[PDB]
Design a protein around this nucleic acid. Structure first.
Lengths: 460, 461
RNA sequence: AGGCGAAGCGACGCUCCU
RNA sequence: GGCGAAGCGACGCUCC
């Protein structure tokens, strides 16, 4: 099935970042743009906006620019171009076209010129990308965009001539990068001193302020009453943020380490309590979540958040939202459905206190599903286990023992692809902030994925 | 002056609890009940109230009833009678004193003892039966011959005098009133230790009782309920409203952080460490050289994990945050926290725990904070547990001599120094009391001339 | 000459249509 | 009869 093969080929870069993979990419992309360009458009939209990928969606757009679907379905190409170019995504399209050696199409030239002349200047300079070989300057030298107005022409002159450009272009570049500034630009221009941070507090919103609270406390701003009131009124709307629970627990762990005042700790506690990840999975769910000490592995250098804490808070908020049973397994399958009376932060702190050790998946399956004859339909397992000869066959027997029983195993180490269910077991095969939607689109299966994709992720 | 001797003898049992001191008590009490029993009344008016005691109050009343002020100044002896007999079991206290001193029980003493016995509320009477002790309510009832004007009074009297051998109606009466209008302990004993009994004890848990029963609440998972969360928050918002002492907030908060209570109650306890300020008449520029020495780190009570220097440091911290001035913490280094005032008070005392503990070097602290820097203030409060030295405060005395109205207000927690006039301008409390601030306020005027302060300030009923 | 399409190195020129 | 006092539910005694 070419559809599922293309899906699993493109999707993996959400957690993965000539050549056999490249050759398969070219052949499958060209063939499925010739036959089913609607599928490729929906797939590019999905891989751009939900899974999270930048190079591959615009690469598929460039492939769609190189077939009969350019003439027949030009509006579809506009749709996928809009849904992919979320900026410097045009830079990615030129980078792809140059690296893989295809000629610069005239229609591609006009599309790139329209993007260049319509992109807001702030994104054009913040993503100027002079150091890159495929730069904005190279894009101008290759496509020759038409300056619709004088100020755009002055930006183009600045790109093409560097500091050796006209002084008017240099001053224009200096102003529009020092106007309408974010908190980062104000901080860089005015220095790192308490008053500048006080002025930047209104501009600190969301994940930015969540990560800047450490500096706010380092400068003693958390002890001021007005900052307290602002942060409290802001935490009132903290619930509606596009922030993942792992960021919340990372900020709370940083505050614990640095000794924050307890009001901000309680605020972030109740914020972590309501970080519900959206899903269409419905019914009683049993989460055999990896909370093992080995499954702990730091997310990044700066983030003190440790991998199993992220996995556990994800599964814990999931079990709180959908009911079911949150069995934490490291060596023993600890059942926490009787501890659901606790708050979410208290639950995850109890998990980080009481969950660690080795990795024994099969014993957890037998304890929570087989021996107890679990009555549910869905078993969401998030794990980093390596490839095994005979991976999950007790689970296969369990799903064979009844009707409409499915499994979604996540291999956060990338040891499996985004593979459509074989023996009623779908595999995510990596760790992403949007693993849940990967489970959601994997549950359907390879037979009906095309219809689901065209119905759900069709670009406008 | 006999008046000051009377005061320093009376006021010491906040921290200190025949006999040579007992004999001095008898002689001084008799002499000043004959001469100036108004001083006795004014002193015993607040001797139990502020510098709380139990044995010394009603002792001056027994002496007053054994003097001619019983005849001339009957309202005066009634005033101290009322002020010393606050609780319901202090009539056994006056019986115990009258017996120990060996006096014969006069008729007017019989009438006053009957006033404190018969007119007492029944619940206090049975809660303070004290049948274990030798001088029990049974002995008092046998000695007094109380007059039951109503039937139920005679039922309680028979119940005490006969134990379980009394009439069944008296035993039944003892059983109902002990099971009506009950305290949290009685509700818990009657209904058992189940979560429901603690939920229903929560409304009756107000003030110190709730603050000390929070840990038992959490033992049953009470802190995880949202409604219990809200109720505990509402009652905690008035933690400073009641005169809960600072060491109680910090002792509850230490167990709270140790047991991992939900952070809503933890933040409220840490902000309650912004203790309701120890009410002080001392005003103006102040410099609190508080002990944070490790030896001064001995817990106020055995159950409370909080150590004594926690109470002392929180007292000094709220005092400096209310009255201004300079907070110098000394164990080894003289830390001036007046630059770290911007931290929350819990942050203040927590960094006091971090930077405190160790030895005791008072001389270097007073040199750095007072003399060398020429502290412009007039009040230097040193809560300390330091032992007696050959020359404990002479730099301080020289500092007082260097200016006008310059005074010292040492407070030694050991209880080894008297409530005394500032000699060479150094007033000493000489005991760890939960109301040390009012003792040092009374010491500001000073024991030798303290009589005018007493008569002007403390009015007896 | 204008629009369209494409080839290559600022949009000129070239093919088709007008 | 009321008060005071002494001794042990209060009588009795002093004074009124």
């Amino acid at each position: 099935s070419p559809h599922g093969e293309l899906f699993t080929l493109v999707a993996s870069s959400l957690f993965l970042g000539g050549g056999e993979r490249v050759e398969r990419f070219i052949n499958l992309a060209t063939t499925l743009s010739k036959e089913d360009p609607e599928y490729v458009a929906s797939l590019a939209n999905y891989a751009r906006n939900e899974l999270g990928l930048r190079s591959n969606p615009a690469a598929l757009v460039a492939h769609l620019f190189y077939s009969n679907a350019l003439e027949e379905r030009r509006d579809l190409i506009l749709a996928t171009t809009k849904k992919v170019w979320q900026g410097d995504d045009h830079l990615e399209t030129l980078a792809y076209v140059k690296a893989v050696g295809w000629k610069l199409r005239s229609a591609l030239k006009k599309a790139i010129a329209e993007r260049l002349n319509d992109i807001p200047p702030s994104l054009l300079l913040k993503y100027k990308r002079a150091r890159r070989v495929v730069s904005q300057r190279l894009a101008i030298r290759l496509t020759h965009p038409r300056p619709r107005d004088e100020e755009r022409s002055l930006l183009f002159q600045y790109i093409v001539k560097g500091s050796r450009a006209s002084e008017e272009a240099k001053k224009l570049a200096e102003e529009v990068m020092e106007e309408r500034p974010t908190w980062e630009r104000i901080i860089s221009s005015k220095g790192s001193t308490p008053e500048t941070w006080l002025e930047a507090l209104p501009h600190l919103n969301g994940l930015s302020l969540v990560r800047n609270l450490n500096n706010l406390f380092k400068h003693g701003l958390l002890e001021n009453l007005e900052v307290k009131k602002t942060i409290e009124d802001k935490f009132s709307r903290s619930g509606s943020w596009k922030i993942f629970p792992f960021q919340y627990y990372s900020a709370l762990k940083m505050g614990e380490k640095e000794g924050w005042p307890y009001w901000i700790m309680a605020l972030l506690e109740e914020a972590l309590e309501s970080s519900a990840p959206e899903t269409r999975l419905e019914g009683e769910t049993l989460f055999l979540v990896d909370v093992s000490g080995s499954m702990y592995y730091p997310v990044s250098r700066n983030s003190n958040l440790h991998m199993a804490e992220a996995a556990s808070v994800l599964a814990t908020v999931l079990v709180k939202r959908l009911g079911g049973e949150l069995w934490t397994f490291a060596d023993e399958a600890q059942d926490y459905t009787g501890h659901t009376h606790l708050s979410t932060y208290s639950l995850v702190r109890k998990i980080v206190r009481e969950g660690r050790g080795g990795t024994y998946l099969e014993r957890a399956i037998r304890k929570a599903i087989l021996d107890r004859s679990w009555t549910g339909r869905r078993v969401v397992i998030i794990t980093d286990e390596q490839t095994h000869d005979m991976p999950w066959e007790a689970l296969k027997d369990w799903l064979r023992s009844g009707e409409n029983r499915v499994a979604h195993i996540i291999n956060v180490a990338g040891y499996l692809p985004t593979a459509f269910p074989e023996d009623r077991i779908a595999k995510v095969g990596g760790w992403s902030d949007k693993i849940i939607t990967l489970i959601e689109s994997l549950e359907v299966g390879e037979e009906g994925i095309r219809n689901f994709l065209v119905s759900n992720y069709l670009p406008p």
